[model samples]
Every structure is written in C-alpha cells, then in structure tokens.
Target chain A: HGELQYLGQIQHILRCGVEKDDRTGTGTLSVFGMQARYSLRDEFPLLTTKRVFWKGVLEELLWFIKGSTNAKELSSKGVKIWDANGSRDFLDSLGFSTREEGDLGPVYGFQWRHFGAEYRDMESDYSGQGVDQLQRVIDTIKTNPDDRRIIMCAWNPRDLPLMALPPCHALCQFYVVNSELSCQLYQRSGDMGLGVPFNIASYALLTYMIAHITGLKPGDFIHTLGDAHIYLNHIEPLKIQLQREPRPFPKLRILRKVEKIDDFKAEDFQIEGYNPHPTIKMEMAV
Target chain B: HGELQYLGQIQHILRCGVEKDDRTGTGTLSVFGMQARYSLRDEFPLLTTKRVFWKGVLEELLWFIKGSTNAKELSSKGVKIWDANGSRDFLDSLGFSTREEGDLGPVYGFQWRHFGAEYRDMESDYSGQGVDQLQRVIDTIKTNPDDRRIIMCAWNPRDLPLMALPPCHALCQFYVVNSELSCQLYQRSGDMGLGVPFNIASYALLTYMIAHITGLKPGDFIHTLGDAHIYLNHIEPLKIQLQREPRPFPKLRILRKVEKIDDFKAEDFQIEGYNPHPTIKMEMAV
Candidate 1:
C-alpha cells in the first residue's frame, strides 16, 4: 500500500538521512532521491496513518485549475494554505515589494494554464495568451494517448525570480497505457511529515479528475522526490505516526459526470471509507 | 549492483508492460513510471551487461556543456549521433524548413546553457542570454549544499516547438549530503535497450564531472523515468543482453583537476577497469 510506502520512507529518512539545514531556519534530516508509487485503481491514496487536510487540498487544487494566482482567491474559499507565502511581509522579504498582497507571481496555476505568457500581476487577464499546458495535455490524452510528450511543467526558469517562492512540485508528466491515466510528479523537495501526505492526496485527486473528464481510469500516482526530508522539529510527531499501522485507503467517488477538467467542484467529490488516525500537530517551517 | 536493478526493470517491462504505438512508428511495450538508483561512490555506472558507447557519451556531453546547438560540431568531431536529426530532410519534415542542415535548434544544449533565451537560429550568438542553470547549480552546490532548489531543467515548453526533437531527459536536480554530491534525472521517456544504458553513463559522468569541479565525492545517481519502455525492435536485443550476468562497474578517473566546468576536454578522463560483455546491436527508432 502507498501508506506503507509513505511510512517506510519516513523510517528510512530517520535512520539513514543526514542532518541538513534548509532555507527555513528549521533544520532537516534529509535524503536525496526517493520514489513512491500509489495505485489509484478503484481508490484514492489519502494516507490513513495521519489525517490530511482534505478541505485545503481540494480547494487549493480547484483554485490552481482555474488559473488563479492570487492567494486571496483561495483564502476567500476558506483555503488559507497560500496565505503565509502571500503575505506582504513575505513578499517584501522576497524582494517583491511592489506586488499586491496576495499576488504570488507566476506560480503553479499561472504556469499550468498560461505558460510563457507575460506576467503583469495577479489580476491581469491571460485567457489565451500563452501555451495552455493543462488543456494541451488533456487534449493530447484524448487524441493521442500514446504520445510520450504529454507533460505539464510548473518550474518555469524565466518566472522563478518573479514567484513568491519557487515551485517544489516542479514538473509532472502524464502517461497513458491500457486506457488508464497515470501521473508522475517530479517534486524537487518534499516535507515528509506534513506536505508529502497532502501532495499524495492532491495529485491522486488530480489524476482522478482528469481521468473522469478524459474517459479513462486512474492507474498510478508515482511521486518522485529530490530532497526527501523531514524537518528536525517534526521528528517526534513523525515517529509517533510511524508507529501507527496503516488502514485501507478510501475510494474516490465523483458525484457527477464532469465534462471538462475545470468543471468539477468540491461538492461533486466524495471520499468514502476514510478511516484514519488522529491528527498530529507539527509546526510548519514557513 | 545497479546493473541488477537495470536488468530487473527490463524484466518488469517485459513481463508487465502494455503495447503502445509511438511517434517513430516503432511500437513499444511500455510501463508508466520506474526508478533506479545507481551508486556513484568509487565507481561509474557504464552498464556491464551490454557494452555502452563511452566515447559518444563523453563527446556529446562535452558538446552540450559547450552549449553548441549545431550537430555539425559533434559530427565534425567524429560523433554522428545527432546528424540524422540535424539532416535537412528531417528538419523539413519537422517543419524547420528554413534552418541550416546541421542546426538541431534548442534541443538539449541550448536549454542546458541558456534556458528561456530567444531563439533566432542555431548560428546566432547567445553569449549572455537566458538563465545559466548549469553554472547556477554548481554555485548552489558550493555555496548552499543543503539548499533544496539545486535544479537544472531542460524541458522548456516555450522552446519545445522550435527544436529538432523534444528533450527526453527533461529535468535534473542536484543534492548534497555529508559533503557528497548526488543527482536525480527526470527523463520523460527512455528507450530501455539503447538509450537508457547510455543515459545512465552520461548522467553518472555528469555527476562525476560536477563532483570533480565542486570538490566533493560523488554519492549516487538516481534515474527516474516516466515512460520507461522497450522498443518492439529492441526487445530481442535487450533479452539477449539481460540474459548475461553483470560484471563490476568501471571506475572513472579524471586526469586533471578542472577548475571551471567548461574547461574539461575529452583528453582529461580515463575509464579504469571496464570489463564488459560484447555489445548488443539495437536499431535506433529515428
């Protein structure tokens, strides 16, 4: 199970990873590369060992799909995950002093929808300005599922300087075989304790959403990480999490037949049989 | 040994991969996502089961390091690997009719040395344009070894349509731990029999070269693939190669202490104790 895989990775980092400092003052025990494959066949890969923020994950992803760059857009929908990075203080620290408060310049959503498009601010209209990679990938999946170049990249080098923070889940490639859609995400860095569980659920949901629209089954969500690390402060909480046995993954049920990828809303998705251990509180680095 | 890992991946694909048509019209038995970790500690991962072309790998990498977009440069140096792609007929077929015969456009080298640079033509001078990701990665390795953003991406969606062929080995990230450097490559598509063995060696050499210049011991080379496939024509040759047992990997010895990354030439390297089985012939898809 992917849950066991997640637990095993944490145990590995605790035992074999080396102590390393990070951009955040909070140090980490890090290992370089790791891959974990979670099967999306007839199930969602929400980690049952710890309670992931399902609400935040769903809302933030929906926000991303709409090509929204303003954190206030998500924050307005009761998803405050991007609020910390979108704060004026954080913006000034990153030398984006003139940017509006919630303007996370050319981040994930912007790159997903309008890659190579010029970025003016969070409020600029960019409907058909640049390469719409997400739509293009979906179209490719529909037309030529066997094509190998079906990819969506969020790590734009030209736009990195303008971003509030560089992308961690940098690039992702989609593969279609046996009429099943599988996604492999190349995440440059992963917060093992907190972020990884959320990322897993997020991407798995994304694969399911795309599969729903594209007339395919969700196959696998392969997560490949560069700096797979657990923050030093999160050690105890993760240890406690590691001790807990994993339960069965819940099944994702789409409430309606969604025609377009962007049409799915939070209410149209249901997570059935999501039995999980209690939430363990760990402080975020930033 | 990583050789066993490679063999196992081949075996897995043979056993479980689905049949799929590709761009080259050479059908493939493909699996979605796979990962292999090859240790670069005191050894190089030139595949021992079947011989890999060491000279071509070295010259092509050096050519890429020089940011030479013209395939004639390597062809002039007796490496004809890119000549087929750079031929006039192939360029015209790919809709680059006005381009010179030898110009390969912004494929790998141009993206490596100068990502996001405006592409007029291959012959145009691009001395100080776009982001220098390779040098920037090296600088990060030296200055902040623990920094998680040490990434060099070759997948430019903006530049993909301007190239001879899209990049297969798309993005790579560097990591440092315990004063040792490691690399992870996110290759979107890999031809198991022909291309993968060379890719393993090429990236291992790249890690070795970077480790050499940055004054750190080489650690590991993690190769992650999205569409890990065996071309239908290559299956038999790969089967023959896989049947052979793996010998010890060779050791890479640099003859000189290169100060700058660009200063290293072909003469300054040696592969010590490379004992391998005879080469297996496989046809290139192109």
Candidate 2:
C-alpha cells in the first residue's frame, strides 16, 4: 500500500521554494534535504502502491556498485532501464553528440569499480570495491570503534571526467553506538521519484549487511540529500502515487550462509510479507 | 566580523540533542549540518576575532585539492598543521610501520589528483585537473542549467586503504540558478574548530575561481556536514576565541589572468584587510 508520501513531500518542498508562497509564480524553486528511516525486518520497504520496477532498481544498484556500464548485462538480468538512452542518444538530449565508445565508457560503473589511484601500485588494484569497503568500515566499527576512518566514499573527482555521470550519493559515514551501527549517506543529487526509493532500500540493505557482518544491530539509516528533487516531468506521476496509502513494509531476509562481502547477490535477498497497491508507470530522466 | 555565531548555534544543537542527537554515545557525540551564505565582495570571509592561520589554511587546502600525502611539502611551506598525526604517522600509529618512501602519501591530494582507474582510466591522463573541472561545471551551469550531471566530487573510497589518513570533507556539488553558481559541499566528518574555517574559505575560493572563469556570479556556499563537531581538545581554544571581540573581516582577492585551473599557485592568492588575534594550536584526530 505504500504510495507517494515521498513524492508528496518532495512536491511540497519544491512548491514552497525559498519562501512559503501560496502564489507559486513569484517564488524561486527550492529543493532542500530529507531523510527516511525504515526497518527491513518488518517489510520489503518498496513504495509498492506505485509500480516501481524493483528488478531495474536492483540491477541499477548492482550495476552502480559493481561499476558496470554495459546495458547488455543489465538487459540480460531483465532490466532495460538504460537501453533507450544508451550513450550519445542521451547526450543528444543535452545538446551534445556522443563521442567514441572508449571516450564515454560506463561512467558510473567505472568510477564505482575503480575509484582513482595516487601511486603506481594502487593503480593495479583500485576496483570500485564499495561493498567491500562498506564491510571493512563495519568491521572497524565493531572491532576498532575509536578509529576515526570508518568511512565509505563513492565520489572520486579525478575520475569525474571519465564518468558518463558522476555519483550523486557520493559518500557515507558509519558510527557505532552501544554496539549498533548507524549509517548516514550523503547524496549530492537525488531524484525523488525514481532514485530516492531505490537509494533508501539500497542503503538500508547496506546498513543491514554491515550490521550483520559486524555482529551489531542495525540502528538508523539517515539518508541526507543535497539537491533532492522531482524532475519537472515526473510531477504528475508522483501525485498519483502519493494518493495511495502506505502499506506495511515487508521483511528482507538475506542468505545466512554468506559471510564475506564479495558473496552477496540478487539471489541472497528475499522479501516476505510485503503487501502494497499496484505499481504505476513513470518515465525516468535517464 | 564572522565570529562563531554558527559555531555557537552548533554547540547549542549539540547540547540540546533535540534536532539531531547521538543517544547511543559510542562516541556518537553530536553532529551539525549547516549552510552559510556570504557576500564575497564585502568581506574576505575569515573569522575576524578568531586567529585563522591564513597561510596554513591555504597550503593545506591546496595540498588536499592537489592530493599530496607527504607532510614535507606542507612542512616546507611552513604549514605543519597535519605533521603530527599526518598520513605517515597514522600508518605508524596503526602499527603498520613498514611503509615505503611515499607509502603514506597525502590522502586528500592523492584522491583528488589520482582518483584511480576504478573511477577513471589511469593511462588517460586526467589527474591534476581540479581547477578545470570546477570551471567546467560552472560554465555548464551558466549555459546548461538543466543538466542533472552538473556535479564535482572529491571522495574516492579506493584510495582510502593506502592513504595515511582517509579524506573527510569528501564530496561537493554545484548548482546554477539565473546564471549564479552556488556550491554545496557534503563533508562526511568535520572537526569544527580547525577544519570548518579552512573548509569555508577554501571552498569559497574554489567557488569564486570557478565563477570568475565561467562568467557566473557566486551565489552561496552550502556547507553540509555529516558529523560536524569540535574535538574535545579544541573546546578551550574555541571558547577563548568566542569570548574575544571580532574585528572587521578582510577581503580576499585572487589574481586575475590565471584562467587555466592548473596555472594557480599559492602566490596567486592574496588576502587584504585581515586583522585578527594571535594563533593557537590544537591537535588533529587524523
């Protein structure tokens, strides 16, 4: 039953702008930050009332963290989210022709997989190991709580030029209090309709994974955004979704056998008791 | 005067723990996130009463943006702010003392300059280009405000393991509205006393440089912090600085004719009208 509460909140903020103006014409559009907390043990945590393509969401999250830009790989996994706007076709929308394939390789994937290297040796082994890094930080929190470097980052300025799109949810930090690991993700830009829900679930799962691996309970997932917004085009669909009531969240169960960070996969995740309204259709802004 | 009004606000928030608090206390201290707007033309933006090491601040900012880890270069410049618990020392502190000659390289500088291949191709020659990217983003914002990919990042997770100390004030994003470029920086962790002042000035300069190159006016510098805090060690010094009366702020002037980003050097920056008290020392957590 989870509908568009997220979408409605975004709309409310955008409409209010810099000043609270009931008369919208004179106001400068303002987009502020917001955060949502959910318990994966209780519900699947999907905005079920709206037809969010859960498969695409999963694939994209995997693709981004894995640093894979190959749309074919995603398409093979039953997700075609990026196929229509592949390469220069999407760049064409932004008034630029596509360059050579190598020039525009999987930007997000490449950045995620390989971050950047300072020394010659690090260059050989700097794959975008976000999942591994998350686990490492979790371990540090549990074992060495006083270590101030318990951090996971996605933004690499040195790699920004090579990326087709730089990371929006750039860096995240974790802290352990009373043996519970609480996470806060800093997103540079957030598309409220399409990206927020997935970001929420992905980070929540990340928190859960870290907590489970470190033997700590999942505390809170604070999702902080810089420019969180609903694209001008997605406003109507968001309204429709917001009208639907929120359903009880589903519980997410992971395969207990997997111990290491590298061992997680789509098959490892199972959603149970998630009951919500049907999904809705909304075109993504690439 | 730009005394610590905001810093006081942060202290108040920390004490109240009402808006944002760390109940668990596993060093869950207090976190403050804020955005401060300043008119660059009117003031240099450094706190007048609190003695901010202007030279040290510039050198360290340049070092981080440059991505160098060695304390020697900074030490050579008479800025040993990070000397004591620097990257090399952090490695030693962690008992991994057998580091190669540049093993504990400058964490922030390396990440900003070499942001590795997982994020970008090392062979492609894109490192040491921060000033260019900053300018390009501003230009795009002035010309193409609708582009959702207008982002600049500094956080590189891949580089963390090798770093003597990982980067903190990680990712920053810039936006354009009506030909005015506004920047938003998301620092995963902030040491309010020492780090925040330098961050404010460094980013403000970065914003100004980009604005100058892109023909856009500087709008706002939004500083969003994840764990914004004053080290318990810096409390006494901060309190003393707060008690002292503030003088008028100085004006910061960047040399003209340095259009290319890489062309900038410490000599190009000039601070006019800065009048403050004597400097005080406080240790960094590294």
Best by DockQ: 1
DockQ of each: 0.88, 0.22
Off by over 4 Å in 2: A1-9, A16-45, A48-51, A55-70, A85-142, A156-166, A240-257, A261-278, B1-5, B12-45, B62-78, B85-106, B109-146, B236-286
Native-referenced DockQ of model 2: 0.22
TM-score of 2: 0.73
How many clashing residue pairs, candidate 1?
0
lDDT of 1 by residue, A204-262 (tens): 99998899899998988899988899999999899898889888899879988989887
For each candidate, what is chain B's TM-score? 0.98, 0.79
Docking class of 1: high
**Residue-pair clashes per candidate, as listed?**
0, 35
Tell me the TM-score of model 1: 0.98
B1-286 per-residue lDDT for model 2 (tens digits)? 3445555654553575322222223232454344445555546568765678788877877766554566766778898676665455555766657753334443555444444433222123445443334445656666666454566555555545545555666666776655676777777666676677887888888877777767777777766666666655566676676667777778777776666666678898898887777777776554
TM-score of chain B of 2: 0.79
Instruction: DockQ for candidate 1, please give it.
Output: 0.88
lDDT of 2 by residue, A53-149 (tens): 6667666766655555665667678876666545556545444353432223435545444444331221134454333554466567766764545
How does residue B61 of candidate 1 score in lDDT? 96
For candidate 1 chain B, the 10 contiguous residues with the lowest summed lDDT are: B142-151
